[PDB]
Design a protein around this nucleic acid. Structure first.
Lengths: 35, 138, 132, 314, 105
RNA sequence: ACGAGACUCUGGCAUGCUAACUAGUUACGCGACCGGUCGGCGUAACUUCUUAGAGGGACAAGUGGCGUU
């Protein structure tokens, strides 16, 4: 079987209030400005 | 051509072939107040006491009367005779005399032309009938 | 409740402000015209629109209504707003003027005016409504 | 310019008249429009007491009829309901004989040729043909047809050469003659809808009328701009002067006649019923006209009563 | 959704329900345009389909609804219009000056 | 923009239409006397009872009263 992939955007929208809020926030920030 | 709607009500019907003939006084072919169920037997005696014997010497109304239900088969004979007089007078002399005897008969009683629209209504969910519901426990 | 939904209200208003002359005061004729000059996908909705059109024309026959801007009333209002009297209402042969505005006009270098008549000032200073 | 008075009243009716018509060949019957699946006769007596008689409730029409018209003879009355059907009232059996439902599109009305040559019907697929009793495909209109719905067609009102006019509620009325049958121009600018209009027996006049009132003249030969007379609202009844060329209509209870010479009215006196209530709308009426000589007049209100007038024409 | 709308649809809605990562099952719903839900016209105006996607962690349901555009003839959409939509034919144009002077050839 | 309403099905009404050898008419009729139609069979009336379709029909439409009229 396979697994669906997640954009940092939807990841943040789903885990904004969870144990993984810090990680999703950091990954979203890395997406938006990571150069 | 041929214009024939006869009499009907609720469920029952008195097919009234209107033409020239003997036209004796008969209901279901039977005498004036002689019907076996014996309940609503006066409804036809009333008008024929006003005009006279000459008027019904040429109006043969041959009626096929079928249907169970008193309020249907009765109250359809009055409709049938109203339409018989209406058609006879409209076709023969003028609609003013039909206007007059229809006026007396229909303003006499409303319920010839109007039937009861009430009929058994549908059964629904979770209940023994249309509105009743099954007993609700807690 | 026989309150007409805004669908029939808007449809009737558009019909009547576009086809004012064809409609009348009779429900049957309004219904027929609504059949002719509109696509109403329901017979019940057509009858509702025709009835509200009849009601609206009964409203209009006794005066203007705000939602409908039919052409005859607009033309009437335009012709009325262009009315001018035979003589101006400012063409007063005699103009009542108080001593204070007379003094102002004298200071404004208008003291030779003859159309003005000075009126005696009020004898009391009662102009405020009592408090309470 | 006449003198008229309502010398009395009658009672008993349910259908009220819309269009006046007859045929000179067999005028022994006169029709009247109705809604209760019926078309109603009148009768003639021409005395003081009798001014209108109910004889028969001619039930059997599939709907109510747009306009009333008879054949050249009075042996076939051609009634066209507001759906496309055709009904021919005949006295051979005392009732309607032939009923035609064969038009795929909703025809407004029907017509009969004076010489029984061309049958014309109003189809709504924008295709109009010309039928005949002999079995020859006469003519069809194929390109640059009407942009709206055709209602009825008319011909010469007397014994003369039949000339075609196609008149419709679509404000587009056309006139052609079987000799030329050519179209000069096609332009717009009509300000109202024409119920009906007759053509001159010598093919030189075809009146007009509209809500704006600029009733402009037509001529058979071309579409030249001659004049635009004045007028009232949409016409719902029309009778031509049998002896001259005039015009007439009625903006409700009141009647209005326009004469192409004087254009003025002589003395118009009217009688109207009154009531105590002021906010109550009185009963209305549609229009009036003379039948063939002008000795009796008919009218009826929306209050389910009928009235008849006596006129002195002179 | 973008493809649905450039294809001409009057509106569309895609709802994706199931495991969207994590123990819990989330459901997202993207609705763009207009769409009805109630009455008879849903039978011939809204066309919907449900599919199951088998992933390594579970099943994901995708529900797609497309509200067809009104189309007389051609059978791309429905024939009859929405019953609450009343269309008005424009009365014939009338542009006449004070004096009727027509242009003729 | 959804929902409500509209809408779909369902009743309640057509002396109008479309017409039915499967249920319902028939006096160029036999299965009747001392001028009342008489059931396996007797069915050039485009049908009223039955069936079902194309439509019609109702809109707070009319009137009176209350209400920003």
């Amino acid at each position: 079987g396979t697994d669906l992939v997640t954009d940092p955007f939807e990841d943040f929208e789903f885990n904004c209030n969870t144990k993984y809020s810090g990680g999703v926030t950091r990954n979203l920030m890395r997406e938006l400005n990571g150069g | 051509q041929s214009v024939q709607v006869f009499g009907r009500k609720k469920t029952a019907t008195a097919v009234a072939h209107c033409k020239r003939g003997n036209g004796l006084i008969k209901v279901n072919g039977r005498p004036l107040e002689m019907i076996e169920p014996r309940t609503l037997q006066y409804k036809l005696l009333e008008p024929v006491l006003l005009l006279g014997k000459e008027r019904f010497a040429g109006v043969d109304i041959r009626v096929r009367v079928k249907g169970g239900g008193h309020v249907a088969q009765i109250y359809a004979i009055r409709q049938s005779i109203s339409k018989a007089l209406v058609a006879y007078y409209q076709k023969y002399v003028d609609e003013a005399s039909k206007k007059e005897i229809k006026d007396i008969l229909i303003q006499y009683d409303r319920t010839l032309l109007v039937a009861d629209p009430r009929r058994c209504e549908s059964k629904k969910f979770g209940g023994p009938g249309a509105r009743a519901r099954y007993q609700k426990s807690y | 409740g026989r309150v007409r939904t805004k669908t029939v209200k808007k449809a009737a208003r558009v019909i009547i402000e576009k086809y004012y002359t064809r409609l009348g005061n009779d429900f049957h004729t309004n219904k027929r015209v609504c059949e002719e000059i509109a696509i109403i996908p329901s017979k019940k909705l057509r009858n509702k629109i025709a009835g509200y059109v009849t009601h609206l024309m009964k409203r209009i026959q006794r005066g203007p209504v705000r939602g409908i801007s039919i052409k005859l009333q607009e033309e009437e209002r335009e012709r009325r707003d262009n009315y001018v009297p035979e003589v101006s209402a400012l063409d007063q042969e005699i103009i009542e003027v108080d001593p204070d505005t007379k003094e102002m006009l004298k200071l404004l270098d208008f003291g030779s005016l003859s159309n003005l008549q000075v009126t005696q000032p009020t004898v009391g200073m009662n102009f405020k409504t009592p408090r309470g | 310019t006449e003198q008229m008075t309502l010398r009395g009243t009658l009672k008993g009716h349910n259908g009220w008249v819309t269009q006046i018509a007859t045929t000179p060949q067999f005028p022994d019957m006169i029709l009247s429009a109705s809604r209760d699946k019926t078309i109603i006769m009148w009768k003639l007596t021409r005395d003081e007491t009798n001014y209108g008689i109910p004889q028969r409730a001619l039930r059997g029409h599939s709907h109510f009829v747009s306009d009333v018209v008879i054949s050249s003879d009075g042996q076939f009355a051609l009634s066209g309901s507001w759906d496309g059907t055709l009904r021919l009232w005949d006295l051979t059996t005392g009732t309607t004989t032939r009923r035609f439902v064969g038009h795929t599109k909703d025809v407004l009305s029907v017509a009969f040729s004076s010489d029984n040559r061309q049958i014309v019907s109003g189809s709504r697929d924008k295709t109009i043909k010309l039928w005949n009793t002999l079995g020859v495909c006469k003519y069809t209109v194929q390109d640059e047809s009407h942009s709206e719905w055709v209602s009825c067609v008319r011909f010469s009102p007397n014994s003369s050469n039949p000339i075609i006019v196609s008149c419709g509620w679509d404000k587009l009325v056309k006139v052609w003659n079987l000799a030329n049958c050519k179209l000069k121009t096609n332009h717009i600018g009509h300000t109202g809808y024409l119920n009906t209009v007759t053509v001159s027996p010598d093919g030189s006049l075809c009146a007009s009328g509209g809500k704006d009132g600029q009733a402009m003249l037509w001529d058979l030969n071309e579409g030249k701009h001659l004049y635009t007379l004045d007028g009232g609202d949409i016409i719902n009844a029309l009778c031509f002067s049998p002896n001259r060329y005039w015009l007439c209509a009625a903006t409700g209870p009141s009647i209005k006649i326009w004469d192409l010479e004087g254009k003025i009215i002589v003395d118009e006196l009217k009688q109207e019923v009154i009531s105590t209530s002021s906010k109550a709308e009185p009963p209305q009426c549609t229009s009036l006209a003379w039948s063939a000589d002008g000795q009796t007049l008919f009218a009826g209100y929306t209050d389910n009563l009928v009235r008849v007038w006596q006129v002195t024409i002179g | 959704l973008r493809f649905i709308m450039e294809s001409g649809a009057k509106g569309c809605e895609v709802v994706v329900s199931g495991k969207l990562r994590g123990q819990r099952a989330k459901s997202m719903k993207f609705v763009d345009g207009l769409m009805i839900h109630s009455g008879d016209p849903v039978n011939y105006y809204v066309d919907t389909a449900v599919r199951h996607v088998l992933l390594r962690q579970g099943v994901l349901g995708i529900k797609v609804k497309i509200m067809l555009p009104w189309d007389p003839t051609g059978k791309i959409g429905p024939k009859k219009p929405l019953p609450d939509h009343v269309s008005i034919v424009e009365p014939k144009d009338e542009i006449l000056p004070t004096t009727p002077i027509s242009e003729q050839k």
